Amino acid sequence: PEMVRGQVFDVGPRYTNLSYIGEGAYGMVCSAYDNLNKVRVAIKKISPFEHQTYCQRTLREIKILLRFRHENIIGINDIIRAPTIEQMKDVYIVQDLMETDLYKLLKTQHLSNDHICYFLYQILRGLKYIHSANVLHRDLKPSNLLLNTTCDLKICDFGLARVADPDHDHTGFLTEYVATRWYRAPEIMLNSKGYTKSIDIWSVGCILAEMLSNRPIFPGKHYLDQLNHILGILGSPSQEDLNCIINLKARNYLLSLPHKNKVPWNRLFPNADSKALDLLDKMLTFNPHKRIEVEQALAHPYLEQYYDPSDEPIAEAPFKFDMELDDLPKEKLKELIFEETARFQ
Numbered sequence: 001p002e003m004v005r006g007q008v009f010d011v012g013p014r015y016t017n018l019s020y021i022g023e024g025a026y027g028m029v030c031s032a033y034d035n036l037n038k039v040r041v042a043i044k045k046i047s048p049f050e051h052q053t054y055c056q057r058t059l060r061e062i063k064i065l066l067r068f069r070h071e072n073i074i075g076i077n078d079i080i081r082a083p084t085i086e087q088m089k090d091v092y093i094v095q096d097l098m099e100t101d102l103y104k105l106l107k108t109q110h111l112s113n114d115h116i117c118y119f120l121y122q123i124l125r126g127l128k129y130i131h132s133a134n135v136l137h138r139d140l141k142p143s144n145l146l147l148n149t150t151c152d153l154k155i156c157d158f159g160l161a162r163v164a165d166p167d168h169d170h171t172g173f174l175t176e177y178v179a180t181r182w183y184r185a186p187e188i189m190l191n192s193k194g195y196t197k198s199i200d201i202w203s204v205g206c207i208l209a210e211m212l213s214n215r216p217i218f219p220g221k222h223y224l225d226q227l228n229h230i231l232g233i234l235g236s237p238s239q240e241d242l243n244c245i246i247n248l249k250a251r252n253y254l255l256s257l258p259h260k261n262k263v264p265w266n267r268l269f270p271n272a273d274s275k276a277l278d279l280l281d282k283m284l285t286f287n288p289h290k291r292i293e294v295e296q297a298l299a300h301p302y303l304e305q306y307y308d309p310s311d312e313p314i315a316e317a318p319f320k321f322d323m324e325l326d327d328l329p330k331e332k333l334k335e336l337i338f339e340e341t342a343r344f345q
């Protein structure tokens with residue numbers, strides 16, 4: 001029963017020589033050797049059974065990754081668990097090991113324009129597939145963009161992923177959110193639950209900007225501070241953009257603010273490619289309806305080098321409706337997780 005950093009991993013014997021990777025609220029990631037395929041891999045221990053929300057996240061994640069099959073998206077090789085619902089205390093996801101993530105990379109390395117262009121392509125390529133399955137990742141960030149030595153990119157961490165529900169997007173002003181702050185679309189703060197594809201595009205824009213200068217573009221310190229950062233660069237939203245925000249609290253807040261001028265991208269990123277900045281402008285659009293879509297982003301002159309519609313696959317079977325796990329209790333969600341994982345026993 002090998003243990004890592006005070007956490008015990010019941011994964012043997014197939015997996016040996018464990019090494020720590022990352023720690024999550026209700027999970028932990030480590031590396032290990034797989035004696036049945038003769039290479040080291042990534043193993044994620046998930047202990048979501050004490051909380052209901054975690055059980056929900058876990059079920060959605062497993063279900064999505066199981067269906068998904070794409071070069072730029074992390075898959076599941078195996079799942080380790082107790083043979084009975086009773087003895088199941090943890091769930092272990094086995095996945096391909098990647099050398100590093102973009103977050104770790106941006107901390108220490110300057111990226112060449114060639115690297116930025118290629119990374120962005122693979123992110124959009126993966127995202128095209130995700131969105132084609134009517135799925136929103138909802139938490140894209142450098143830390144869940146994994147890379148290897150040959151600069152291949154894989155998307156991971158589908159904990160907050162959900163089936164898109166555009167019709168049920170509307171919400172009040174300042175409604176709480178779970179996704180990482182720095183990468184939250186401005187609409188989250190004003191009128192959106194983040195149930196539309198456009199929010200993933202905002203995140204990719206923030207990542208592109210971060211790739212450009214190695215610093216987050218909108219590092220807010222709290223819910224509202226995030227909005228101010230965005231507005232401090234994007235400038236005051238126009239009359240047309242305000243007309244799409246009908247809830248009064250949000251609109252009256254924006255109208256209460258002093259006029260702020262747009263900060264020109266070329267001023268923020270003086271070394272950047274001008275086509276890259278043109279695309280960055282389209283991804284980072286205040287109005288979600290005017291925001292560039294993933295397939296449009298791929299066809300952008302900045303990515304002309306890798307653009308190929310034929311080699312940008314889409315999902316064979318899209319997800320129909322979001323699972324009704326909101327009302328489900330821990331115990332029953334323990335049962336569905338058990339069943340979804342039966343195939344690997």
Ligand SMILES: COCCN1C(=O)c2cc(-c3nc(Nc4ccnn4C)ncc3C)[nH]c2C[C@H]1C
Binds near residue numbers: 021022023095097
């Ligand atoms: C605890 O759950 C929280 C969510 N979460 C994961 O799901 C997850 C999966 C990996 C992973 N990481 C590597 N490699 C990697 C990255 C950095 N360093 N090295 C070695 N390879 C393969 C995988 C699948 N990393 C994480 C950390 C966070 C984002």
